[PDB]
Amino acid sequence: YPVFAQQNYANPREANGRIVCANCHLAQKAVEIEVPQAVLPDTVFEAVIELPYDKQVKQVLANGKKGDLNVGMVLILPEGFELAPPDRVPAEIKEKVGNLYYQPYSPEQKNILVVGPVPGKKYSEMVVPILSPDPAKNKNVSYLKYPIYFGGNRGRGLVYPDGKKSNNTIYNASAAGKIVAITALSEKKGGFEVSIEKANGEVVVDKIPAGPDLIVKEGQTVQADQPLTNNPNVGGFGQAETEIVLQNPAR
Ligand code: HEC
């Protein structure tokens, strides 16, 4: 979630240009962003974002069932740029944005907007209203060509802030040995327990939560770190760049 990024990285964009969502949403899926090639000072323009994905395909939910995906993003604008205030946003534009509540990454970083989690069904495409700055007032911005960084995500991440995996990833054998048994868990608890008899006869038991499907069976021998399930993840993260020129009016 965008809040996980806000709570674990002062700056969402790393030196090499990679966005921190990429530290937990490990699969890549293309995204697109579009802004006008140029804008006048203190003006309201729009950024249009695409977070494409097949909506017929469902993901593994936290509870282990299948279901809809949620989207979120981070928009890194130049110093000085900021979310357009409600009163400066055209009604036609207001309707386009919908019931979305963009927010600064931090109170001190008003040029970094985030949003989500929100339903992917209705927000596969998002419109963000930005207020261009004015160098004639702000010493920190000039009439240049500025870069714009974007990061969009679809689906539940594979790793939590504490470092543990979610149920939306590949599970591997904790040891090498023969699979002596595969017990399904409850009916409400879901998942399976895969008992592996090691060379020394000791039997370890790998717990696999509901979500991913098994690709092994009783009698099969596996190596340590060998995948026991498929890769359930159907979401993805993506980054895109663009740029905008901050025009200099001339009277
Ligand atoms: C690792 C510490 C993470 C960071 C950094 C970010 N996300 Fe994340 N995200 C993470 C997990 C483990 C999950 C699943 C949580 C759960 O309880 O199931 C998520 C989930 C989201 C979602 C929800 C999608 C859904 O289908 O429900 C969204 C839209 C999302 N994350 C977006 C997102 C963005 C844009 C981030 C960067 C700004 C980002 N996440 C970072 C783990 C982590």
Swiss-Prot record:
Subunit and partners: The 4 large subunits of the cytochrome b6-f complex are cytochrome b6, subunit IV (17 kDa polypeptide, petD), cytochrome f and the Rieske protein, while the 4 small subunits are PetG, PetL, PetM and PetN. The complex functions as a dimer.
This protein's encoding gene: petA
Cellular localization per UniProt: Plastid, Chloroplast thylakoid membrane
S-S pairs: none
Annotated organism of origin: Chlamydomonas reinhardtii
UniProt cofactor note: Binds 1 heme group covalently.
Main location: plastid
Topology with respect to the bilayer: Single-pass membrane protein
One Gene Ontology biological process: photosynthesis
Family: Belongs to the cytochrome f family.
GO molecular function: electron transfer activity; heme binding; iron ion binding
Binding site for heme: 1, 21, 24-25
UniProt protein name: Cytochrome f
GO cellular component assignments: chloroplast thylakoid membrane
Keywords: Chloroplast, Electron transport, Heme, Iron, Membrane, Metal-binding, Photosynthesis, Plastid, Signal, Thylakoid, Transmembrane, Transmembrane helix, Transport
Purpose: Component of the cytochrome b6-f complex, which mediates electron transfer between photosystem II (PSII) and photosystem I (PSI), cyclic electron flow around PSI, and state transitions.
Cofactor(s) required for function per UniProt: heme
